[PDB]
Amino acid sequence: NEDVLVNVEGGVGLLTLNRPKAINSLTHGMVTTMAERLAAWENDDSVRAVLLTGAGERGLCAGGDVVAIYHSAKADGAEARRFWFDEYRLNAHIGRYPKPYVSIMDGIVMGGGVGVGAHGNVRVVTDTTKMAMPEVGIGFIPDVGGTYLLSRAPGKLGLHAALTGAPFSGADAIVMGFADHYVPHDKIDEFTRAVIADGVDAALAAHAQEPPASPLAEQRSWIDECYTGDTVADIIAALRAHDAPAAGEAADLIATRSPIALSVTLESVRRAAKLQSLEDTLRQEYRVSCASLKSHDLVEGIRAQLVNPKWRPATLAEVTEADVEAYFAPVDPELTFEGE
Ligand SMILES: [Cl-]
Ligand SMILES: [Zn+2]
Ligand SMILES: [Zn+2]
Ligand SMILES: [Zn+2]
Ligand SMILES: [Zn+2]
Ligand SMILES: [Zn+2]
Numbered sequence: 001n002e003d004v005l006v007n008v009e010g011g012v013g014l015l016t017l018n019r020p021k022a023i024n025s026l027t028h029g030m031v032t033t034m035a036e037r038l039a040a041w042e043n044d045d046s047v048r049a050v051l052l053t054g055a056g057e058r059g060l061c062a063g064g065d066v067v068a069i070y071h072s073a074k075a076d077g078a079e080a081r082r083f084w085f086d087e088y089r090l091n092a093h094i095g096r097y098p099k100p101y102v103s104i105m106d107g108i109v110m111g112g113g114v115g116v117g118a119h120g121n122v123r124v125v126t127d128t129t130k131m132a133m134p135e136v137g138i139g140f141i142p143d144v145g146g147t148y149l150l151s152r153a154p155g156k157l158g159l160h161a162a163l164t165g166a167p168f169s170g171a172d173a174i175v176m177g178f179a180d181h182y183v184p185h186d187k188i189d190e191f192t193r194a195v196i197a198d199g200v201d202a203a204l205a206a207h208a209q210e211p212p213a214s215p216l217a218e219q220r221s222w223i224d225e226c227y228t229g230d231t232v233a234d235i236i237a238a239l240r241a242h243d244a245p246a247a248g249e250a251a252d253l254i255a256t257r258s259p260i261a262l263s264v265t266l267e268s269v270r271r272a273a274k275l276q277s278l279e280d281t282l283r284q285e286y287r288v289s290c291a292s293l294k295s296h297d298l299v300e301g302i303r304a305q306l307v308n309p310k311w312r313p314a315t316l317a318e319v320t321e322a323d324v325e326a327y328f329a330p331v332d333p334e335l336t337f338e339g340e
Contacts, residue, residue, distance in 0.1 A: 001018065001019075002018060003017075003018055003019050003027060003029055003030050003033070004016065004017060004018060004029075004030045004033040004034060005018045005055070006033070006037055008041075008046070008047060009196050010195075010196040010197055011046065011047060011048040011049065012047070012048065012049050012050070012051050012195060012196050013037065013041045013047045013049070013050040013051070014050075014051050014053070014196075015033075015034055015037060015050065015051070015052045015053075016052075016053050016054065016055055017030065017052070017053070017054040017055065017060065017061055017116075018054075018055045019055075020054070020055040020056030020058075022062070022065070023054075023056070023058050023059050023061065023062035023108055024054040024055065024056070024059065024060060024061045024062065024113070025061065025062050025063050025064060025065045025066070025112070026061060026063070026064045026065060026087070026112045026113075026116070027065050027068065028068070028079065028082070028083045028086065028087075031083065031086050031087045031090055032086055034052075034090055034116065035086065035089065035090045035093065038050065038090070038093055038094070038097065039093075041099070042097070042098065042099070047099070048099065048100070048199075049099055049100035049101070049102060049195070049199075049200060050097070050099060050100070050101045050102065051102045051103075051104070051192065051195055051196075052101070052102065052103045052104065052116060052117060052120070053104040053106075053188075053192065054104070054106070054107075057107070058107050058108055059106065059107030059108025059109055059113070059130070060103070060104060060105050060106055060107060060108070060109045060113050060116075060117055061108075061109060061110075061112060061113025061116060061117070062108050062109075062110050062111075062113060063110050063111035063112045063113060064083070064087070064111060064112035066138065066302050066305065066306075067306070068080075068083070069083070069298075069302065070299065070302040070303070070306070072293070073293045073298055073299050073302075074299060077290070077293040077294075080289075080293055081289075081290060081293070084143070084286060084289050084290075084335075085286070085335060087112065087115065087144060088143070088144065088145070088282040088285065088286055088335055089335075089337060090115075090116070091115045091116070091119055091144050091145045091278075091282060092119075092145070092278050092279050092282055092337055094116065094119045094120055095119040095145065095278045096278075097120075097121070100121060100122055100200050101120040101121050101122065102120065102121075102122040102123075102124065102195060102200060103116070103117035103118070103120040103122070103123050103124065104117075104124050104126075104188055104192065105117040105118065105123060105124060105125050105126075105129060105131065105170075105173070105178075105179060106124075106125070106126045106128060106129060106185060106188055107126070107128045107129065107130065107185075108130050109125075109129060109130070109131045109132075110130075110131065110132045110133070110134055110167075111132075111133060111134065111135060111142075111143075111144065111146075112144055114131065114132075114133060114144060114146055114149070114178065115143070115144025115145060115146070116144075117179075118145075118146075118149055118173075118178045118179065119145055119149075119278070121180075122180060122181070122200055122204075123178070123179040123180045123181065124179065124180070124181045124182075124183050124188075124191070124208075125169075125170030125171075125173050125174065125178075125179040125181070125182055125183075125211075126170055126182070126183055126184060126185040126188060127170060127182075127184050127185055127212075128170075128185045129169060129170035129173060129179075130167040130168075130169070131167060131168055131169075131170075131172070131173050131178060131179075132161070132165060132166060132167040132168065133146045133150065133161060133162055133165060134165035134166075134167075135165065135261065135265070136162070136163065136165045136257040136258055136261040136262050136265055137165045137256070137257055137258075137301065137305075138258075138261075138298065138301035138302045138304075138305055138309075139258040139260070139261045139292070139295060139296075139297030139298045139299075139300060139301030139302070139309070139311070140261060140289075140292055140298055140301065141261055141264050141265050141268055141285070141288050141289070141292060141327070142162055142265060142268070142269075142285075143285045143286075143288070143289050144285075145278055145281060145282055145285070146162075146285075147162075147268045147269055147271075147272035147281055147284070147285055148272055148275070148278050148281040148282075149176075149177060149178055150162050150269050150272070151269050151270075151272040151273035152177050152273075153175075153176040153177055153178075154175065154176065154177075154217075154220065155220050155223060155224045156223050156224050156226075156227035156228065157175070157176055157216060157220060157223055158176065158269060159223075159227045159235075159266065159269055160216075160219075160223045160227055160250065161176065162265050162266075162269055163227075163232065163235065163254050163257070163262055163265060163266065164250050164253045164254055164257075165253070165257060166250075166253055168216050169214065169215065169216075170182055170211060171211035171212050171213065171214040171215075171217075172214045172215065172216035172217070174211055174214070175214040175216060175217045176216070181204060181208045182208060182209055182210070182211035182212075183207050183208055183209065184209065187207050190206075190207060191203050191206075191207040191208075194206055194207060219246055222239075222242055222244065222246065222247050225238065225242065226238035226239045226242055226247060226250075231263075231266070231316070232254070232259075232262045232263055232266050232316055233316045233317065235254070235266075236251050236254055236255060236316075239251035239254075258297040258301055258309070258311045259311055259313050259314070259315060259316045259318070259319050260295065260297055260311075260313060260319055260323060260324075261292075261297055261301070262316070263316065263319045263323070263324050264288060264292075264324055264327045267324050267327075267328075268284065268285070268288060271284060271328075272284065279337050282335055283334060283335045284328065286331070286334070286335035287327070287328055287329060287330065287331050287334075288327045288328065290331045291326060291327040291328075291329060291331075292327065296311075296312045297309070297311055297312065300312070
């Protein structure tokens with residue numbers, strides 16, 4: 001099997017993620033294929049644009065392959081670090097890319113799938129889009145430039161998405177700055193065909209629609225009320241005190257997540273909000289990911305997903321400021337972006 005299908009048609013470089021039985025989860029091989037093709041096509045005049053899609057019907061991409069990260073974290077972390085090094089460089093390159101990069105973020109789009117789709121410049125979601133950064137549920141922290149996107153969402157919507165790790169819709173994704181355009185699922189095929197035949201602007205004019213109401217946008221009042229707290233424990237207390245079902249549901253979900261991952265996530269998004277550069281943000285995320293490889297909760301979190309995680313530390317009250325600060329320590333080598 002070719003885990004990424006590659007072709008050029010109508011002047012469009014086509015990248016189709018192709019592990020549909022795994023909802024197209026990303027391997028290191030898939031990342032390097034994408035990266036090499038983006039590099040090869042960048043100065044090739046026969047390629048006017050790039051289009052990223054996923055095979056099958058359930059989603060563009062459910063994430064990075066978590067089994068491989070798990071096996072690496074139990075070993076010496078070498079593959080995980082190399083994977084993230086190459087992946088984050090790819091994320092940055094999509095972010096800078098000079099040619100139109102159209103991503104079809106249909107169906108399930110989570111974690112690493114956000115990384116390959118949501119830094120594009122023509123970002124399409126649909127009525128089946130279920131997008132999330134669910135990292136705290138496995139003892140991890142949103143990466144792949146997710147902290148850059150989360151910190152740029154309106155209000156505190158980004159913190160809500162990051163701490164709950166809950167999915168949000170296509171319309172929500174547009175509100176949060178993770179996507180640009182809305183096309184119903186049973187027009188993606190016509191839309192994709194039109195990009196290839198008539199170009200991006202014609203395809204959009206012909207198939208894009210006004211998104212429906214964003215439920216996340218309607219929740220902004222209590223999100224902004226409750227997520228201004230200094231600590232995750234402050235946030236949970238406020239959500240409970242607001243005494244309404246949607247806030248309570250958020251609190252309940254947060255309370256299932258890794259305490260250390262939640263704490264590092266809150267700090268990451270707050271620090272990312274002060275960084276202008278996608279590259280600088282990814283450098284921070286790389287330190288955090290590297291640190292997470294040495295953690296109890298990353299292994300426990302992924303284990304539980306594969307096989308009720310028992311987090312350690314078990315409570316937010318046991319998380320110290322030094323525990324959080326440890327995730328932001330320098331590493332050697334730092335993530336670098338040269339070789340363009
Ligand atoms: Cl570039
Ligand atoms: Zn379909
Ligand atoms: Zn393995
Ligand atoms: Zn590798
Ligand atoms: Zn470039
Ligand atoms: Zn169709």
